[PDB]
Design a protein around this ligand. Structure first.
Ligand SMILES: C[S@@+](CC[C@H](N)C(=O)[O-])C[C@H]1O[C@@H](n2cnc3c(N)ncnc32)[C@H](O)[C@@H]1O
Lengths: 22, 285
């Protein structure tokens, strides 16, 4: 959100990965 | 850490109210209670293990200790829910980074020196869906990993390490700390695996900055820090004292700028000392 790294966007990438791994 | 200095900076008095935002093992809270037991102290930590120690402490000190379990970003809601108005606290303490429980428990996955699942979540098992460090290095792409290692770890070899991680995980998922440490070392010659300050000091493993980067990302520590500071400022009374202990340049820079009000005559800056940590203390005007 505020330090140059988009945690929201990257978290959603990770959560798609974790769903694929299920 | 700096226990005499922190307590002396907070200067606790009979009847005062304190917020320890980073209870950890309770070291600072117990040192405050030892200098003055006639206080109220709200003790917060995002880590179940630390919060449980606060709960256990509250049985010895039922009138004084209120244990809370939550992140800095959750502190405002927890306080309001506890009936604490803004402008309440005489002092707020933030001792940043990791507790000894997190670093010394192999299973929590914070150390490259002790093998365990690559977890690194300060929240423990509180949020089963919260991504682990393994989820991070297994899911993100090379330029994302390199941005994290450079921005949060200040790692100059971010790109060479990120490439090593993507290559390695293509063969086999990265799930444990020593596994990751040796993948990171693989992106260097066998001689560079240890760094040291001088000839006599301890060897430091080359993957140390990468582990710090992952920890800060997994736990959103710098964004959390900014929220905790604003929450500290809102809930301090005028004349109350903020004491923060920083252990790397990124968090210290955020504290410095927040105190200068130039994140974009609110504080009296009363201490800057290093002790390795950098202590900054200030009085809310
Ligand atoms: C450096 S240790 C503090 C140790 C403590 N002062 C003592 O004397 O033992 C940091 C502690 O604060 C917690 N912490 C770090 N970031 C946090 C955050 N964003 N929200 C809540 N707690 C956090 C960690 O879980 C850890 O237990």
């Amino acid at each position: 959100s505020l330090c140059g790294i988009d945690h929201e966007a990257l978290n959603k990438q990770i959560m798609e990965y974790k769903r694929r791994k299920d | 850490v700096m226990v005499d200095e922190v307590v002396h900076c907070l200067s606790p008095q009979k009847g005062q109210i304190f917020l320890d935002m980073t209870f950890g093992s309770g070291g600072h809270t117990k040192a405050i209670l030892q200098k003055e037991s006639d206080i109220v102290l709200y003790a917060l930590d995002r880590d179940p293990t630390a919060y449980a120690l606060a709960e256990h402490l509250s049985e010895l000190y039922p009138k004084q200790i209120r244990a809370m379990l939550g992140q800095f970003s959750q502190a405002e809601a927890l306080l309001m829910k506890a009936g604490v108005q803004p402008g309440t606290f005489d002092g707020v303490l933030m001792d940043l980074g990791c507790s000894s429980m997190q670093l010394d428990t192999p299973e929590r996955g914070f150390s490259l020196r002790k093998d365990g699942p690559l977890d690194m979540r300060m929240d423990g098992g509180r949020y089963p869906d919260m991504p682990t460090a393994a989820d991070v290095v297994n899911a993100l792409d090379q330029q994302a990993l390199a941005s994290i290692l450079r921005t949060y770890g200040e790692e100059k070899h971010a790109k060479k390490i990120a490439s090593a991680i993507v290559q390695a995980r293509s063969i086999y998922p990265i799930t444990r700390t020593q596994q990751l440490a040796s993948i990171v070392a693989g992106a260097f010659p066998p001689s560079a695996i240890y760094t040291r300050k001088d000839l006599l000091q301890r060897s430091t493993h080359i993957a140390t900055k990468t582990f710090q980067a992952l920890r800060i990302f997994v736990n959103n520590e710098l964004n959390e820090l900014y929220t905790g500071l604003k929450t500290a400022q809102k809930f301090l009374r005028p004349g109350g004292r903020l004491v923060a202990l920083s252990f790397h340049s990124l968090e210290d820079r955020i504290v410095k700028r927040f105190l200068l009000g130039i994140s974009m005559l609110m504080w009296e800056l009363i201490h800057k000392k290093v002790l390795s940590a950098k202590l900054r203390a200030a009085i809310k005007l």
